[PDB]
Nucleic acid binder design. Structure first.
Ligand SMILES: [Zn+2]
Ligand SMILES: [Zn+2]
Lengths: 99, 1335
DNA sequence: TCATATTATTACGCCAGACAGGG
DNA sequence: CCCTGTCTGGCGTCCTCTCACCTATGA
RNA sequence: AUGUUUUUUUUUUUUUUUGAUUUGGUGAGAGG
């Protein structure tokens, strides 16, 4: 099985799972620890922001690849803003501070 | 873009500021059409239009007026994702307190209003009343009231009196709670009391009272008044395949809260009576509490069928919340997965990758390449071209592959060598071809395994895959110094068959002018691959400074050793191939090649090793047959001699001469002896079976048996497995844990019958159950370790210290187990090591000890090295580059940046699978004696007896290093003395552990002081001997009239005056303990070394109990202060022990549980770190008593003992840094001139920078005290709540952070993996240097 | 079709952490 | 009042693949 | 040398760009 780009889920902006659903590989927790074990800071940054979740990042990246410019414009993951709204939907005021 | 994440409470004004409209109706959707509800949960005006830039109902179907809201639609006009960020709010009719601040253990409202949880819930569920500023009545403010208590009060205090209930009353209490006022009171209460329990109970209440005043969190924000609703997009309502909507659980929760709130508003309209609106508000309280955190209240609500439905807190917490399932691990585009296979033609920087996966993973690069050439125009055309797969896109694909690495990943990645980057080579096929040597890194066999491929998209990621994660760059395991590209199984058989010899072959003893014609004689058919031969080889030894000097000579060698010499690079000597080359020898061949010639010859030489091993293993034809497993001819007579022996033992058992346990022990002993004899018979019969003549009489050699080369080469097989295929397969054990007395005398070449196979299945089912349940604890151990580490990044170059732990070789009592060169390899010395002669600067004080320095250490026989350890590093927030050590997979020091906490945590937890889950001293060598911790005396006979319990007996050799060590008890008969030379095997120690010696220092006469027969001691004349002994009783058997009497022996002179201790003016009286029996009676003159009484008496969960720092059930008790010791009160729960120091203050004591067999007498002076009883010892006692270096030596030795018992090589840096992360918190003792509190627990780097910026001023600092937290308590007690929330319980940590108003200055690895940016360790450390500089 | 709103099983194994009881 | 059983909560491995099954009521 | 010398309705509207190809929990079983 292989996936470059196709459909994703509803709640989250990450790719679907499986083969019958044309989906990508779950880059799990211990693989993130293995990339932290190297100096792979940029590989991990595209591994969890551009390739997976951030919608503006992935559309800009697809257009940047097909122009011939391997460069990522990262932004913030969508599932973290989902986390902010689920935490904030309690009586909890979680924010994002100064520039 | 943004610094720290701030968490605080949500005010009702803040919740109305989040909101965009009140969600009234609970009606979800229409359900018969497609439209929602106006205005229900899924509204239009409150949130937004379903369709993008459209009024859902009807107006604006173009792009001109985005925003207009007509009365017929009551709809906003924006994007489809606008509803995902917009949230609604439910105006709760009746106030409802939060469940996270009422049941968090400890509750936030429980230790703030000074009221028990039980009483808080009673009033909260409309079952109890609470007073609130009554007035001039006889009632308190916190005191509650019941129906009867209120009824009577109602008729009594009908006027000025307030007694409400529920959240409303609670809210008022919190609202009317002067925070500041309580502070002073609490502070004054803590300074006006001495109660230990109260002190801790008051310090925990004042800590959460002053923390609330420090932030902008109000006391009335605990109760929920304006409940917030999560965005619809985040609670999606999609239908499955069919005609119904599979609705989420949160819609059930919100719809019930809104149904109940509408009912409660209508009842407060109608003025229903009291009990109706109490049940109505109570059902609303339980509905809100079920929405927020379901199931924390009594049994959780359920929709379909009996399974409870999932609430908001269950969208956060757990293995499947947002942290562990969508933020730490994500699903990933440009990724693939398939079954692996070998492909041995590869070079070790490249892997095979199928054409179909390659054309799917590289669709955008192919699109960009196709658009560059000009073959097509629009993007559609290119997608049709690769959907059709024409003849021109495969050249495009070979031009996008070429220099573009991919990340191969095996699915259980345990350490960092399980993600490696290759270059693709395209494969006709559907299976990833993976280079074989690399398999030993992935733990990848080829029995059905699968791997995932990931594509580095951007340019920095291609460079990170080539420069950090390439497979040529990972040739040493980061856990140690051992190479991980060791040749595994076929190739060592090909080498072991190639470089060997036989006593006659084709071309025996002919002479050859080079290795080239050695291979030419092997190929043409004129010699054999193993035929001993003088060749002329030219080995290049590089003895100058970087210059290779040729020396050519004639080596008496074989043909195969010359053929393998054609592949060895220049610098290695010929003697690396002159031996037989098993697996350990080829591993040290690649290791010496890496240490001498560097990286590139070692990569190309690893490939040439693998190619020539595969080729000559193919030419070998090394099969396995049924005749290869040679049965010993002596096996049947050994079994019959064992059968005669068990017959003799059972004939004694019929006549009852021997006991049953001694029978079972004798049967297990003779079957162990017969098993060892059968193994030696088959091992001789395999290791030297070949006996071939050469030009005359016969001559023997090691065998070319196939199973023996598979065992001796170390390819696959050991002694035990080849033992079970030929000799008997031992004594298998039943699942009771005890062994079975009748062994399995049949191997596998003979047939096992039925019972023997069933006993075998006992033994093997236990092993499969152990692995399949062991793997969960191994993985959870790696998780706890990488979440306690998680932060620690090499961030300096020198901390500027002179402290470091004292690396000695470790010695258990056998031969010296782990040499000093294994422990001080590549670790930077603390002070400069003196050469063992006299005062020489052998090595300087900041030199890395690589192999050349360690060889000059081994030549001089250096005792022990004071070396720098990670736990002694002075760097605030990180570890400096010298106190870590060598890079371990790079030859140099650790770079500024490389995350060492994560590689250390992986290197400790990765061998978690291989670990298991469930008289006197006899010297061995011949050397010199030395004693430490010794205070001794010469007895009458001459044997130096010892008056100290804790004496260490070292055996030092003639060179200076310490070769043996032992522990000698109090009062043992030493055959030798101090500084003496002995012989190998001579007994040097003797004692009796069943009889605790009460030996003396001086001589004289014996008097019975406080020894009265009848109450103190008893008369027990011996039965079978007649020589009686006055038996000393204990303090429990005698009655209360004489229980105060302490029996003792004090030595006098010939007159009767007390003979004093030499050095003091005190007599030497020995107080006899309980259960003693007097050996030497009254009037008998004594000497030293003679007793005065007879006193009769682990694998992987050990690693968990060392890092998590549990206490053992019966710890060894110690002394918190030095000085004289005494006893106390007679058995009220415990038996006291009072320690009065010589110069220090007296009042320390401890109540010992009296079930322990003590070690100390009444006239004994103790010390800190000195034992009082025996058994295991808790690490907190080591930390608060001996020192920090003592507890780090304790953990690294007690866990390298597990990792060495199971045989795993791990360097000690990793355990020292997880020990650093254990003892990172501290507690204050004297607050000093700072802003801390008395017994406040604060982290160590904070208090050290505080009193280091105050001590640089005039003010003297604060004196701390370090504390050792276990790894899950230490990773949950962090100054970064996302780090402590991605890990275990999120409810406790988020309420603690919310009511404290905590802020997360990100500054670690997992905060930046959550929030989606660069890691502040690796390549991103320059980015975080830049961002930290530009503030 | 369109609002009404929650009851008659037990059978893990530590391991911390808080709580009423009593010498 | 300091030990103490006793009770309550909170953990318990990653990755993947196949299949089936989904609230009752109701004038 | 010369041409108002057989006229009659045998009739004028495009594509337009502006947007995408759509699948959530529970429980059971297998591979490594
Ligand atoms: Zn409209
Ligand atoms: Zn340091």
């Amino acid at each position: 099985h292989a996936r470059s780009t196709g459909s994703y889920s509803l709640v989250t902006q990450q790719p679907l799972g499986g083969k019958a659903q044309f989906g990508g590989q779950r880059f799990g927790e211990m693989e993130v620890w293995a990339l932290e074990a190297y100096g792979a800071a940029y590989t991990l940054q595209e591994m969890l922001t551009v390739k997976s979740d951030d919608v503006n990042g992935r559309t800009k990246m697809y257009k940047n690849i097909v122009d011939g410019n391997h460069q990522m414009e990262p932004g913030m993951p969508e599932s973290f803003n989902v986390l902010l709204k689920e935490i904030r939907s309690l009586g909890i005021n979680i924010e994002l501070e100064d520039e | 873009e943004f610094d720290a994440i701030k968490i605080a409470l949500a005010s009702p004004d803040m919740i109305r500021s989040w909101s965009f409209g009140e969600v009234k109706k609970p009606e979800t959707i229409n359900y018969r059409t497609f439209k929602p509800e106006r205005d229900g949960l899924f509204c239009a005006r409150i949130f937004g239009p379903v369709k993008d830039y459209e009024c859902l109902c009807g107006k604006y179907k173009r792009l001109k007026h985005r925003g207009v809201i007509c009365e017929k639609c009551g709809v906003e006009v924006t994007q489809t994702k606008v509803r995902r960020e917009r949230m609604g709010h439910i105006e709760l009719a009746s106030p409802t307190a939060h469940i996270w601040f009422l049941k968090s253990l400890p509750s936030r409202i429980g230790l703030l209003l000074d009221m028990p949880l039980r009483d808080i819930e009673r009033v909260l569920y409309f079952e109890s009343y609470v007073v609130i500023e009554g007035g001039m009545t006889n009632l308190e403010r916190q005191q509650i009231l019941t129906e009867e208590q209120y009824l009577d009060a109602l008729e009594e205090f009908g006027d000025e009196f307030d007694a409400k209930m529920g959240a409303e009353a609670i809210q008022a209490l919190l609202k009317s709670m002067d925070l500041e006022q309580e502070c002073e009171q609490l502070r004054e209460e803590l300074n006006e009391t001495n109660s230990e329990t109260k002190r801790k109970k008051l310090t925990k209440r004042i800590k959460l009272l002053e923390a609330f005043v420090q932030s902008g969190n109000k006391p009335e924000w605990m109760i929920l008044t304006v409940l917030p609703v999560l965005p619809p997009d985040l609670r999606p309502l999609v239908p499955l395949d069919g005609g119904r909507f599979a609705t989420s659980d949160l819609n059930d929760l919100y719809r019930r809260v809104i149904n109940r709130n509408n009912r409660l508003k209508r009842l407060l309209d109608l003025a229903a009576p009291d009990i109706i609106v109490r049940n109505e508000k109570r059902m609303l309280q339980e509905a809100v509490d079920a929405l927020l955190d379901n199931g924390r209240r009594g049994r959780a609500i359920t929709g379909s069928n009996k399974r409870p439905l999932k609430s908001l807190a269950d969208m956060i917490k757990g293995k499947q919340g947002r942290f562990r399932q969508n933020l730490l691990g994500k699903r990933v585009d440009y990724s693939g997965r398939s079954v692996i296979t070998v492909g041995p033609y590869l070079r070790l920087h490249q892997c095979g990758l199928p054409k179909k996966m390659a054309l799917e993973l590289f669709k955008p690069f192919i699109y960009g390449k196709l658009e560059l050439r000009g073959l097509a125009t629009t993007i559609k055309a290119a997608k049709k071209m690769v959907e059709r797969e024409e003849a021109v896109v495969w050249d495009i694909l070979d031009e996008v592959i070429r220099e573009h690495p991919v990340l191969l990943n095996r699915a259980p990645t345990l350490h960092r060598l399980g993600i490696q980057a290759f270059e693709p080579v395209l494969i006709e096929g559907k299976a990833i071809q993976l280079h074989p040597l690399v398999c030993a890194a992935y733990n990848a066999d080829f029995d059905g395994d699968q791997m995932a491929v990931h594509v580095p998209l951007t340019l920095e990621a291609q460079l990170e895959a080539r420069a950090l994660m390439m497979s040529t760059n990972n040739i040493l395991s980061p856990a140690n110094g051992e190479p991980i590209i060791v040749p595994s199984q076929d190739v060592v058989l090909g080498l072991y068959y190639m470089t060997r010899d036989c006593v006659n072959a084709k071309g025996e003893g002919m002479v050859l002018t080079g290795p080239k014609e050695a291979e030419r004689l092997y190929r043409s058919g004129l010699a054999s691959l193993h035929a001993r031969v003088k060749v002329r080889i030219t080995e290049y030894e590089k003895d100058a400074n970087g210059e290779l000097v040729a020396k050519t000579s004639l080596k008496d060698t074989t043909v195969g050793r010359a053929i393998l010499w054609m592949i060895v690079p220049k610098g290695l000597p010929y003697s690396i191939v002159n031996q037989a080359l098993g697996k350990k020898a080829i591993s040290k061949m690649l290791n010496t090649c890496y240490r001498i010639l560097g990286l590139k010859p070692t990569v190309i030489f690893a490939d040439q090793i693998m190619y020539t091993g595969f080729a000559y293993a193919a030419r070998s034809g090394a099969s396995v047959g049924i005749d290869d497993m040679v049965i010993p001819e002596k096996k049947h007579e050994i079994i019959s001699e064992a059968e005669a022996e068990v017959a003799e033992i059972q004939e004694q058992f019929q006549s009852g001469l021997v006991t049953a346990g001694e029978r079972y022990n004798k049967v297990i002993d003779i079957w162990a002896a017969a098993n060892d004899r059968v193994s030696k018979a088959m091992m001789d019969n395999l290791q030297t079976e070949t006996v071939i003549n050469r030009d005359g009489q016969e001559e023997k050699q090691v065998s070319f048996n196939s199973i023996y080369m598979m065992a001796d080469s170390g390819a696959r097989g050991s002694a035990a497995q080849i033992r079970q295929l030929a000799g008997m397969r031992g004594l298998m054990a039943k699942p009771d844990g005890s062994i079975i007395e009748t062994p399995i005398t049949a191997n596998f070449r003979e047939g096992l019958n039925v019972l023997q196979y069933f006993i075998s299945t006992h033994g093997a089912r236990k092993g499969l159950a152990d692995t399949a349940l062991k793997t969960a604890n191994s993985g959870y151990l790696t998780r706890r370790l990488v979440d306690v580490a998680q932060d620690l990044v090499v961030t300096e170059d020198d901390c500027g210290t002179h402290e470091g732990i004292m690396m000695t070789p470790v010695i258990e009592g056998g031969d010296v187990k782990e040499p000093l060169r294994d422990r001080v390899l590549g670790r930077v010395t603390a002070e400069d090591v003196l050469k063992p002669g006299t005062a020489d600067i052998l090595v300087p004080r900041n030199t890395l000890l690589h192999e050349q320095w360690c060889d000059l250490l081994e030549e001089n026989s250096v005792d022990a090295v004071k070396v720098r350890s990670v736990v002694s590093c002075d760097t605030d927030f990180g570890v400096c580059a010298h106190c870590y050590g060598r890079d371990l997979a790079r030859g140099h020091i650790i770079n500024k940046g490389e995350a060492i906490g994560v590689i250390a945590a992986q290197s400790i937890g990765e061998p978690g699978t291989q670990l298991t889950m469930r008289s006197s001293i006899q010297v061995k060598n011949k050397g010199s004696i030395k004693l430490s911790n010794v205070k001794s005396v010469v007895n009458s006979s001459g044997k130096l007896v010892i008056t100290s319990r804790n004496t260490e007996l070292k055996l030092i050799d003639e060179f200076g290093r310490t070769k043996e060590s032992y522990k000698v008890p109090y009062g043992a008969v030493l055959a030798k003395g101090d500084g003496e030379q002995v012989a190998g095997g001579e007994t040097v120690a003797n004692w009796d552990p069943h009889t605790m010696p009460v030996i003396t220092e001086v001589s004289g006469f014996v008097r019975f002081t406080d020894m009265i027969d009848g109450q103190t001691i008893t008369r027990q004349t011996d039965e079978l001997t007649g020589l009686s002994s006055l038996v000393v009783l204990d303090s429990a058997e005698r009655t209360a009239g004489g229980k105060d009497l302490r029996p003792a022996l004090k030595i006098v002179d010939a007159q009767g005056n007390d003979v004093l201790i030499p050095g003091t003016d005190m007599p030497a009286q020995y107080f006899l303990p309980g259960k003693a029996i007097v050996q030497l009676e009254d009037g008998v003159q004594i000497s030293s070394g003679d007793t005065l009484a007879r006193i009769p008496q682990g694998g992987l969960p050990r690693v968990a109990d060392l890092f998590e720092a549990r206490r053992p059930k019966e710890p060894a008790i110690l002394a918190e202060i030095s000085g004289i010791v005494s006893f106390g009160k007679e058995t009220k729960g415990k038996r006291r022990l009072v320690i009065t120091p010589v110069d220090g203050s007296d009042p320390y004591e401890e109540m010992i549980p009296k079930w322990r067999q003590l070690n100390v007498f009444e006239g004994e002076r103790v010390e800190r770190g000195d034992v009082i009883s025996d058994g295991p010892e808790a690490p907190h006692d080591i930390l608060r008593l001996r020192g920090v270096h003592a507890v780090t030596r304790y953990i690294v030795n007690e866990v390298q003992d597990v990792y060495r018992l199971q045989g795993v090589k791990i360097n000690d840096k990793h355990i020292e840094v997880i020990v650093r992360q254990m003892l990172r918190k501290a507690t204050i003792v004297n607050a000093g001139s700072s802003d801390f509190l008395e017994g406040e627990q604060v982290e160590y780097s904070r208090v050290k920078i505080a009193n280091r910026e105050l001590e640089a001023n005039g003010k003297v600092g604060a004196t701390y005290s370090r504390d050792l937290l276990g790894i899950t308590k230490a990773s949950l007690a962090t100054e970064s709540f996302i780090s402590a929330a991605s890990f275990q319980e999120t409810t406790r940590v988020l309420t603690e952070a919310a009511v404290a108003g905590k802020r997360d200055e990100l500054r670690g690895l997992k905060e930046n993996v959550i929030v989606g940016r660069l890691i502040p360790a690796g390549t991103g450390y320059a980015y975080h240097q830049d961002r930290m500089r530009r503030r």
